[PDB]
Ligand binder design. Structure first.
Ligand SMILES: O=c1c(O)c(-c2ccc(O)c(O)c2)oc2cc(O)cc(O)c12
Ligand SMILES: O=c1c(O)c(-c2ccc(O)c(O)c2)oc2cc(O)cc(O)c12
Ligand SMILES: O=c1c(O)c(-c2ccc(O)c(O)c2)oc2cc(O)cc(O)c12
Lengths: 211, 211, 210, 204, 211, 211
């Protein structure tokens, strides 16, 4: 009964779902999945997601996985509550397509690079691993290209999909929160519109709740 | 100025768009982008997609890129013509979410593996390279797990998102067409429901048109 | 009093925690948030300029390096709780034999056990697929170390002699993790090593940190 | 006659093809289907037991290894078409100078150019570099210094030393690694000269 | 009978033991283990150290291996002879712990780095192998961080464990002797207290004996 | 002497040149280039070889590098002294091509494998380093395939290029000398013609001179 999220509060993909729920002021339960004990690779979690990845999700009888399918579900199902995470006119098909391009770009261009950069610079340090400075330089060069495109985009519009905050922006937040604690931060601060966009989206109450 | 697709007829992502257009019986122009001459990495193509990847797309004044954003746009904008590529009740939000899970899974689990297997076994030959049999074995093991999940899913429903053919199924077609010309074919034929599903979706007139 | 600055999941931190519990000492565990890089910032760097958990405090005495901290606990609080030194702690040859084993844990066991844990547990957190070649290479190394331990444990009940000491204790946290992986088989296929693992992991101080 | 058993896209096969065209020789290209593992089966293994394209035939003479084949072509058909040896081919010191360059192409250039051309052509196209470019830059700095002193790498004329680079360079010119060539004025001229040759354009 | 060291006079770990024996003015025999013939990886050396590393050690019936266990044994067993290698008040437990921190740091932070640097720059050169300049640059950056810490430490105290020379200092000597014959030398000379410390500990008669 | 070799006596490539000079009974000077002091990476060595590798070579005013270009030069320039290192009829172009195939095969197929096997089993073991048994097994499998080809070849002819000893055989000698001091020896002894060939070429006076 009600809304449940099956994940881990440090997980980027889990936080993506958590932020959207808070944006909608929805009540939910966070059911912790213990990644260190391989709980995500065992039953009964595998019955919620056979690919063994956090998060999984429940709204009454509806069972979901994949963070970006979950956020979009939340944005449609609870459209008329809290922050609107869709475009202002959500029935406008061309406007939706524009938001969708950005969501695809976050997934394909931004997320894999931002992840490697977080792994090399934060998570390797945890254990006993030295950060490979060549990977860092190569990935930062890739991230810089992505952010150059974003800079051009944000000269034209207040947010990535148009004049309002949407899922396109929201999906970037968790990876950005981690990158802000690394020297990769400079890539954001050296680009004026990107920098303002990062400051706006990370200062939101829903973003701060999961941090 | 009607519908234009800027891509290459051999490209998997381009074919994804082409199949959807044909499913809708839409008229369009395919404008050839010459990948061999790096036309995708030059202006004016970069003004249609700053990431330098085929396909880009145009419908009148609307300019898009990312194959799966384009197909979705087609499925909504031209919903009431040709094959319905959305769920039967397209305003059902839970049902949309279920289709979206499958589209995410195709993108994250299927496509990277099916693409490597096509590169190693088909497209390395184009450049005079030999196929690395270790990569082939490794990627086939991954593909087998994905297809085991699909097999279980297709015991329960006729197609991956439910009773009816949708974008979830369509998105797999181009990679599958290529994999059918390789020994990786056995992974599909080994699995009775998967095999039927492949035979159904590849025999469709829209699928055969791009082949 | 006694403070430990670390993280309860950390192998090195657990090494110190187990020794404190073995001595029935009261202490405060002050959490250092590794995910936020707290270990690479001040004020933690003023306790350990190498940016590694754990650091440690006993009144005015400030320490780091888990195995230096354990030793000290064993000496400073020798006459309370479990004796973590040799039975006759003033016997110099007997101390040297314990010290060989502590050096071997550090050089031969720990780096290998740590790679095996990273590949098989901690990569799975994050997105990453375990490199099966590293796992096979490291397991071959670990097998050689454990063959030496097996021979040793045919002669003596524990690694330094007839009693449980720091030499055994220092292995416990890495072993607790490796027991949750298929590397477990390397322990179970060696009868004396298997018994030794079961004995040291079942200790109340070991179970406390798990 | 002359037969080449290989694949037209293959760098090593193209090396042989260019030398044959330079000599205006007639030959048959017999396609070996790498995708079906034809190179790892009989009867190709009876032409090269190492299972690599190209293999080669001139009448009864059976060869493999591209750089042995090109050199054979340069000697056997010396007085026809382009001279691929040094001008005075009986000058032993001059030959040795050409041979140094042929070794350098094989050891220093080819492994690096090969990784690069392939990592990138394929990133650009099917969605699958800094270390190798740094290595290539060193090799090209040496070539730049060399080409300040002489028109081509072995001296004043085009030889096997230059020819052996062509196929890898043709691929690298379709990638951003092109900048390493254009950054270096003498290298850039050399690349333009050797890639514009009719024999080079024939295999492209 | 008596004290025997089973090792090789060029070995770093062997020299560690030799320096401590000379500091105590002890008589001993060095029994040569021929590394070039793999004598360390054969019986009977394996019966003295099953890990196949020099040195092994004997004091009457007591059989040892691991250089730092051997040096500590020497420092305790023969405490009241020659140079005191322990702290001035050797029964002071906190003072011992401070020496032990430094010994742990030498082992974990200094030695693996110094050792890679010596292998790359000196030992590969003996056999005509080429030094990997990337490893050298990477490891020097690490060594610089360790030596910055040592510099700060040596501003406060004359030696690393306090006011007197101890095992903490001694354990560094052999690696340093080798690194002084390489360009890595500059890392010691550019740090004024480190440089003084190096000059003091390498000019000791026991240090010069093994050089 | 008119002839100088700038190298290191342990270096496989240097020894290749040395053996050829001794085969011709030529007088020469070996100048030992000090790798430990980075002499190979400094002027004036870099004027002999801008790639900073041993050997370089001088015959009067002629300056060369690359071992196999040097040996070939020696074989031509001093053809009618000492051992003939070319084919019996050195002007026979097809016969030269057959020798050239073998020299290419040594370079590409034999040398990189034999080198790794020597590094893993000889160079590393001397120091502290554990020989990676997976690399050894992988490389031995490759070497076995090469030696199977050689076995078939040596059933047909006395040496690898035909009836007489040539550069094709000579170029293998230094790597083989090292591999004979390792368990990889078995790969040579288990193949009867290969074994006879190894015994013949390693027992030559010129081969023994550099050992
Ligand atoms: O219910 C949903 C929905 O109606 C649409 C939608 C509507 C108009 C469009 O133009 C469009 O592209 C998508 O998207 C979704 C996307 C998801 O990921 C999940 C959903 O539950 C919906
Ligand atoms: O106080 C300590 C001490 O006395 C000894 C010691 C005693 C006898 C021996 O034979 C020996 O090898 C070591 O070790 C220590 C090691 C530490 O890290 C911390 C300590 O406080 C002590
Ligand atoms: O002087 C040389 C020479 O004449 C030839 C040559 C001659 C006839 C042939 O058929 C052939 O293939 C090569 O090769 C060489 C190869 C070198 O590396 C160095 C040289 O100095 C010569």
């Amino acid at each position: 009964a009600g809304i449940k999220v099956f994940g881990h509060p440090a997980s980027i993909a889990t936080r993506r779902v958590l932020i959207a729920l808070h944006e909608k002021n929805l009540d939910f339960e966070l059911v912790h999945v213990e990644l260190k004990d391989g709980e995500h690779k065992k039953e009964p979690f595998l019955s919620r997601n056979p690919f063994g990845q956090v998060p999984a999700f429940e709204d009454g009888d509806l069972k979901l996985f994949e963070s970006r399918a979950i956020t979009q579900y939340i944005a449609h199902r609870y459209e008329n509550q809290g922050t609107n995470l869709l475009q202002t006119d959500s029935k406008n098909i061309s406007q939706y397509a524009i938001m969708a391009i950005g969501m695809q770009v976050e997934d394909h261009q931004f997320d894999p690079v931002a992840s490697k950069l977080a792994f090399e610079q934060i998570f390797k340090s945890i254990y006993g691993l030295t950060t490979d400075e060549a990977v860092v330089a190569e990935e930062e060069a890739k991230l810089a290209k992505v952010l150059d495109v974003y800079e051009a985009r944000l000269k034209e519009f207040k947010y990535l999909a148009g004049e309002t905050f949407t899922l396109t922006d929201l999906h970037h937040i968790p990876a950005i929160q981690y990158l802000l604690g690394t020297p990769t931060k400079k890539l954001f601060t050296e680009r004026p519109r990107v920098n303002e966009w990062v400051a706006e989206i990370t200062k939101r109450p829903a973003s701060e709740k999961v941090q």
